[PDB]
Amino acid sequence: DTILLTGLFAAFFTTFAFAPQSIKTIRTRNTEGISVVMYIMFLTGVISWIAYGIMRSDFAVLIANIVTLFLAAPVLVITLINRRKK
Amino acid sequence: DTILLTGLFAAFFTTFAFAPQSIKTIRTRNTEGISVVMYIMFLTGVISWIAYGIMRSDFAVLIANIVTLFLAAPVLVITLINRRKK
Ligand SMILES: CCCCCCCC/C=C\CCCCCCCC(=O)OC[C@@H](O)CO
Ligand SMILES: CCCCCCCC/C=C\CCCCCCCC(=O)O
Ligand SMILES: CCCCCCCC/C=C\CCCCCCCC(=O)O
Ligand SMILES: CCCCCCCC/C=C\CCCCCCCC(=O)O
Ligand SMILES: CCCCCCCC/C=C\CCCCCCCC(=O)O
C-alpha cells in the first residue's frame, strides 16, 4: 500500500520536474540543441521500461514512462520536422 | 531472468541517453539555464525511486536512479555554487 504510494510519489516528481521544458519545446517548436540520437536512445529505454513495468506489474514504473513517452515523442517529432526543413 | 535483463536494458538507455549532458556540465561547470527548483524536485523523486526500488527488490530501478543520483547531485552542487558567486 504505502510502497506503491512511494513509487507514485517518485513518479510524480521525476516526471514533472522537467516537464515544463518539454511543454515549452512543444509549444514553441524550438528544438535547437536537441540531439535526435539521444532522444531515440531515450525513447528506446522508455519503451523498454513500459515492457518492464508490465512484466513486473508495476504501475508506478508504467505511468511514469507512459507520461514520459507522451512528452518525449512529440519533442522528437518536432525535432525531425525542423531538421528536415533545411 | 529475461525480465530483469529488460529492466537493465531500459536502465542502460534512459540513464546514458543524456548522460553526456551532465558530464559536460560537471566538466565545464557551466550551469546557465539550470533551475535549482527543478533539480531539487528531480532529486526528491530519484531518492524516492531508490526507496521504491529497495522495497520492490528491483535492481533495475535501483541502479538506474543511483547512477542518476551520481550525475544529478553534482550538477545541482555546481549550480548552487555558481548561483552564490553573484
Ligand atoms: C526527459 C527529457 C530529457 C532532457 C534532459 C533532461 C535533463 C534531466 C536530467 C536527467 C535526465 C532524466 C532522467 C531520465 C528520466 C526518464 C524517466 C524514466 O524513464 O522513468 C523510469 C523509471 O520507471 C525508473 O526510474
Ligand atoms: C504521443 C505518443 C504516442 C502515444 C501512442 C500510445 C501510447 C501507448 C503507450 C503504451 C502502450 C502500452 C499500454 C500497456 C498498458 C499496461 C496496463 C497493464 O496491462 O498492466
Ligand atoms: C505502441 C506504441 C505506438 C506509438 C506510436 C507513436 C508514433 C507517433 C504518434 C504520434 C506523435 C505525436 C503526435 C502529437 C502531436 C503533437 C503536435 C506536434 O508534435 O507537433
Ligand atoms: C554523489 C552523490 C552522493 C552519493 C552518496 C552515496 C549515494 C547513496 C545512494 C543510495 C544509498 C542506498 C543504497 C541501497 C542499496 C540497495 C541494495 C539493497 O539492499 O537491495
Ligand atoms: C543517503 C544519501 C546521502 C547523499 C548525500 C549527498 C550529499 C552531496 C555529496 C557529494 C556531492 C557530490 C560531490 C562530487 C564532487 C564533484 C565535483 C563537483 O561537483 O564540483
Author numbering:
A (entry chain A), B (entry chain A): 2 to 87
Task: Give excerpts from the publication.
We crystallized EcSemiSWEET by the lipidic cubic phase (LCP) method and obtained crystals belonging to the space group P21212 (Crystal-I). The structure was determined by the Se-Met single-wavelength anomalous dispersion (Se-Met SAD) method and subsequently refined to 2.0 Å resolution against the data set from a native crystal. A total of six TM helices from two protomers create a central cavity that is widely open to the intracellular side. This cavity penetrates into the dimer core, but is completely occluded from the extracellular side and the lipid environment by the tight association of the extracellular regions and the surrounding TM helices, respectively. Hence, we designated this structure as the inward-open conformation. Within the pocket, the hydroxyl group of the glycerol head group forms direct and water-mediated hydrogen bonds with the side chains of Asn66. Given that glycerol and sugar share similar polyol moieties, the glycerol head group of the bound monoolein molecule is likely to be mimicking the sugar substrate. In the present structure in the inward-open conformation, the putative substrate-binding pocket is occupied by the monoolein molecule mimicking the substrate sugar, indicating that the observed structure represents an inward-open, substrate-binding state.
The SWEETs mediate the facilitative diffusion of sugars, by allowing solute permeation across biological membranes down a concentration gradient. SWEETs possess seven transmembrane (TM) helices, consisting of a pair of 3TM repeats and an additional helix that spans the membrane to connect these two repeats, resulting in the ‘3+1+3’ arrangement of TM helices. Previous studies have shown that the SemiSWEETs assemble into dimers to function as sugar transporters, and thus they are considered to be an ancestral form of the SWEETs.
